[PDB]
Design a protein around this ligand. Structure first.
Ligand SMILES: Cn1c(=O)[nH]c(=O)c2c1nc(Cc1nc3cc(NC(=O)CC[C@@H](N)C(=O)O)ccc3[nH]1)n2Cc1ccccc1
Ligand SMILES: [Fe+3]
Length: 285
């Protein structure tokens, strides 16, 4: 039989909450950071569709961490990011307050995206099942972290944080072709088999999180996981990295690495082409 799936955007209230630092977390021994993280998780747990996303007063330390990462990544984007990223990034600086000394609010970003592509943000406490996470995309909802990485290492995070969301994900959700591509991953997942959902999540991971694209003959980055990580952003376009064409039947067999660089990156020819390839693929699963 078919598992429950959301039929309208407010139904995400029933799965957005179906989500403690792991031993190796840089804030693992810090009580104050631990408290701040509980503060953020509660905001997400108490959020209901229709609410304005609670605005957060970020600490001076949190803003410095953002500024440090932001400054270095922006040096690299012109020569590393795909053109769609570069086109949208300045609109966000203008309308959502992206600055070295200011962390943008998820509510302003959500309002900006609703205008551009109908995408919206939902604060999320932590990891959801792939079924639940992808189901949000069906309604152009991106489940998004609101907390900031620990200040001890601004250049590394073992998990998505809001720097990753804002710098890695948001500029492409503002792009119509990318937004369509993403939504169709969500739509395909609704009520799909467990196997199909895992395959869709892996395709998502190697496009939305770690995808490369070819533009005017050059390899560029569009994956959010690359766009928010200085070392892997550089590595991915280095001579050494193993690169293959995006092909869902093959890509979906690849393991998704969390604690290390990826072993392989997949190149999409364009968002339109990736979208077409997923359409062909979803027919088979
Ligand atoms: C597939 N899926 C799923 O099934 N359920 C979800 O809940 C889910 C999800 N995918 C996401 C979004 C996501 N972005 C990621 C980005 C990375 N990697 C990086 O950012 C590399 C950065 C780092 N090494 C650095 O130092 O910069 C790893 C995992 C990620 N998951 N999420 C949301 C989410 C929210 C909190 C924790 C985990 C996942
Ligand atoms: Fe991500």
């Amino acid at each position: 039989s078919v598992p429950w799936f959301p039929k309208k955007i407010s139904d995400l209230d029933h799965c957005a909450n179906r989500v403690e630092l792991d031993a190796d977390h840089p804030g693992f021994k810090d009580n104050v950071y631990r408290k701040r993280r509980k503060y953020f998780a509660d905001l997400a747990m108490n959020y209901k569709h229709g609410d304005p996303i609670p605005k957060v007063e970020f600490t001076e330390e949190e803003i410095k961490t953002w500024g440090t990462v932001f400054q270095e990544l922006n040096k690299l984007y012109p020569t590393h990011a795909c053109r769609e990223y570069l086109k949208n990034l300045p609109l966000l600086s203008k309308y959502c307050g992206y600055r070295e000394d200011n962390i943008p609010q998820l509510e302003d970003v959500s309002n900006f995206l609703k205008e551009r592509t109908g995408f919206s943000i939902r604060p999320v406490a932590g990891y959801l099942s792939p079924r639940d996470f992808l189901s949000g995309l069906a309604f152009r909802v991106f489940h998004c972290t609101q907390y900031v990485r620990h200040s001890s290492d601004p250049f590394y995070t073992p998990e998505p944080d809001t720097c990753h969301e804002l710098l890695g994900h948001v500029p492409l959700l503002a792009e119509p072709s990318f937004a369509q591509f993403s939504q169709e991953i969500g739509l395909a997942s609704l009520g799909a088999s467990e196997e199909a959902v895992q395959k869709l999540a892996t395709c998502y991971f190697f496009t939305v999180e770690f995808g490369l694209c070819k533009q005017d003959g050059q390899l560029r980055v569009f994956g959010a996981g690359l766009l928010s990580s200085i070392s892997e952003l550089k590595h991915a376009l280095s001579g050494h990295a193993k690169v293959k064409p995006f092909d869902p039947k093959i890509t979906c067999k690849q393991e998704c690495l969390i604690t290390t660089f990826q072993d392989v990156y997949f190149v999409s020819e364009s968002f339109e082409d990736a979208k077409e390839k997923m359409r062909e693929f979803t027919k088979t699963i």
